[PDB]
Amino acid sequence: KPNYALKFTLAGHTKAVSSVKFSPNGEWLASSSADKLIKIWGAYDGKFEKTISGHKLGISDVAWSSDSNLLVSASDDKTLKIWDVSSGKCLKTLKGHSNYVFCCNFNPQSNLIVSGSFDESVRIWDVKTGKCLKTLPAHSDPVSAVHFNRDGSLIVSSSYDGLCRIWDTASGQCLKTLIDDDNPPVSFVKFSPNGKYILAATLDNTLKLWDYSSGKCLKTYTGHKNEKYCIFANFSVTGGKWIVSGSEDNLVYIWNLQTKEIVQKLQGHTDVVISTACHPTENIIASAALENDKTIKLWKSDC
Ligand SMILES: COc1cc(CNC(=O)c2cc(Cn3ccn(C)c3=N)cc(-c3ccc(F)cc3C)c2)cc(OC)c1
Numbered sequence: 001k002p003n004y005a006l007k008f009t010l011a012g013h014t015k016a017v018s019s020v021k022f023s024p025n026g027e028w029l030a031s032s033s034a035d036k037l038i039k040i041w042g043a044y045d046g047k048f049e050k051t052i053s054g055h056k057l058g059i060s061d062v063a064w065s066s067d068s069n070l071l072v073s074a075s076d077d078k079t080l081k082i083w084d085v086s087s088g089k090c091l092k093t094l095k096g097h098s099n100y101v102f103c104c105n106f107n108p109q110s111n112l113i114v115s116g117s118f119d120e121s122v123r124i125w126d127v128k129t130g131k132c133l134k135t136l137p138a139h140s141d142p143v144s145a146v147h148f149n150r151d152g153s154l155i156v157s158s159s160y161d162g163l164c165r166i167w168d169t170a171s172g173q174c175l176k177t178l179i180d181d182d183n184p185p186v187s188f189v190k191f192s193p194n195g196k197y198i199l200a201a202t203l204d205n206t207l208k209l210w211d212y213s214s215g216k217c218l219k220t221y222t223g224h225k226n227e228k229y230c231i232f233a234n235f236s237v238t239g240g241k242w243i244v245s246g247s248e249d250n251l252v253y254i255w256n257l258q259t260k261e262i263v264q265k266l267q268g269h270t271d272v273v274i275s276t277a278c279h280p281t282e283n284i285i286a287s288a289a290l291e292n293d294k295t296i297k298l299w300k301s302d303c
Pocket residue numbers: 016017018019033034035057058059060061076102103104142143144145146160187188228229230231232274275
């Protein structure tokens with residue numbers, strides 16, 4: 001069992017926080033918010049660094065490039081924006097979605113961006129020019145998450161339509177559709193850090209680990225509450241091998257990845273913990289909550 005303890009509480013956003021992500025170099029934390037702003041924080045001390053402004057409506061998601069020099073953000077204003085973190089400059093504004101943009105990620109080479117939208121499509125963008133390269137008619141309901149695998153050859157997407165799908169990056173072809181017995185909305189998905197599995201959340205209070213090549217669900221993690229919101233989930237690999245997820249009972253849940261037992265719950269937020277992130281080298285967890293709370297909390301552990 002880990003021993004996560006609250007170290008810092010981060011206030012500054014004036015509306016619901018939508019996403020938190022640690023930079024891959026471990027130095028920074030980025031946060032997005034319905035207040036239309038991105039904020040950067042020191043990852044180890046929680047000290048506020050700067051605000052990045054530009055979107056016209058709330059920001060749903062933010063993600064780092066591999067070298068921690070760029071961010072991409074997805075917004076209700078139907079754009080994505082690519083930011084140079086050091087200068088604060090908006091480098092490109094990606095226009096092409098016909099509805100709110102919900103989720104985004106760079107590929108490992110950080111030469112591409114993938115996005116998912118309420119327009120039920122997944123789009124692939126060129127980082128250097130900012131132009132849309134492919135539009136994939138991915139789903140028949142809003143796209144809840146998009147993520148590249150370890151080498152960037154695949155994209156996984158999830159949707160309220162109940163499907164997880166695996167896409168070939170180069171051709172845009174659907175390679176696999178995954179779904180379990182019930183057809184609950186799929187509210188989050190991502191590849192494992194070694195790229196062999198996908199971790200999928202469904203709006204029936206369930207996280208599932210899938211062998212996607214074999215199309216088999218290996219493990220399930222339960223005990224949290226998730227019936228309404230698209231909540232991030234994470235692999236924690238710096239100490240013990242855990243699963244981390246926020247919850248609609250205002251807690252952060254931590255499971256043992258292999259045995260699936262709950263090993264810790266983290267108490268402190270006053271609203272749905274919509275987003276969590278795991279530091280890439282230290283046993284640090286960032287958690288963020290919705291409109292009744294508006295804060296980000298940083299937790300640290302021995303293992
Ligand atoms: C059919 O109706 C639906 C209803 C919902 C309900 N929305 C959410 O749950 C939700 C979840 C997150 C967390 N987040 C962000 C990216 N990723 C991958 C996440 N997991 C953020 C926000 C948000 C967006 C804009 C904003 F200004 C402020 C906030 C807090 C809303 C989702 C839906 O599918 C897309 C279809």
